[PDB]
């Protein structure tokens, strides 16, 4: 299929309670491989997947140097943003940054991203051409002008079109046994009576990888959305994912209902019926 690398950075100011909390996290597709916690003991970038341990000291020394520089810039931004927004020093505020690259089946560059959020909302992102900026508001115009001046787009494009994808590839090779697996869902249905009149059918997908999956109910061969319930795909905690969907049906009518499961692990989509 297609693959991606993503980094996720969060800084949270804590007034009078010291310096900002900073958490950084690295991902290939749906597998976390790297992390930094400003409040952990190591003060180093740390591995979170087996295959990244194949990397030598220069890598760990290069990543730590970088993640610390990212933290330093988020420390400055929390202060700067406060000015741009004319906020007091009493409250807590959040800076978020996300970036990385997507490759298609041929592992070549499809798309790159680089976006910033202040207190829960878009602040500034890089447009899909990776050559200009979209400022979400008037305050972000000040930032956009500074980064246009310092040629940041061009430096980020070089990253997103080359370095990102080169290293994305390398990860995929190095961790082939995990990153390139497919675990097909283990599926089953359950039945629970709400009263004499109604029952809940629940279609389960368990232990699948990657996380992308569809579950859809049908009644007599047609899409059914009314009186259904879908949870967010959740992690199992062993690197696999789980998800379920439910429908409330009239007692005696169960058989009309099918549950349909698409996943990269299912060449042919599964149909489950209670019967």
């Amino acid at each position: 299929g297609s693959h991606s690398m993503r980094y996720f950075f969060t800084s949270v100011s804590r007034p009078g309670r010291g310096e900002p909390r900073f958490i950084a996290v690295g991902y290939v597709d749906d597998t976390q491989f790297v992390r930094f916690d400003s409040d952990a003991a190591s003060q180093r970038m740390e591995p979170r997947a087996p295959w990244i341990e194949q990397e030598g000291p220069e890598y760990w020394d290069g990543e730590t140097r970088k993640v610390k520089a990212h933290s330093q810039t988020h420390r400055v931004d929390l202060g700067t943003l406060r000015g741009y927004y004319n906020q007091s020093e009493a409250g807590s505020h959040t800076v978020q940054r996300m970036y990385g690259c997507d490759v298609g089946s041929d592992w070549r560059f499809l798309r790159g991203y680089h976006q910033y959020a202040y207190d829960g909302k878009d602040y500034i992102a890089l447009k899909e051409d990776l050559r200009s900026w979209t400022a979400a508001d008037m305050a972000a115009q000040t930032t956009k002008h500074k980064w246009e001046a310092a040629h940041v787009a061009e430096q980020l494009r070089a990253y997103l079109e080359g370095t990102c994808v080169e290293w994305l590839r390398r990860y995929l090779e190095n961790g082939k046994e995990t990153l390139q697996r497919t675990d097909a869902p283990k599926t089953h249905m359950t039945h629970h009576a709400v009263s004499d009149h109604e029952a809940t059918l629940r279609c389960w997908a368990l232990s699948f990888y990657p996380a992308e999956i569809t579950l859809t109910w049908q009644r007599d061969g047609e899409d059914q959305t009314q009186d259904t319930e879908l949870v967010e795909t959740r992690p199992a905690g062993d690197g696999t994912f789980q998800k379920w969907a439910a429908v409330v049906v009239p007692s005696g009518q169960e058989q009309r209902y099918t549950c349909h499961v698409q996943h990269e692990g299912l060449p042919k989509p599964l149909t489950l019926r209670w019967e």
Binding site: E63, A69, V76, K146
Partner: peptide, 9 residues
């Protein structure tokens, strides 16, 4: 592999 770019807002 993170980027070198850490420009300030």
């Amino acid at each position: 592999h993170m980027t070198e770019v850490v420009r300030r807002c």
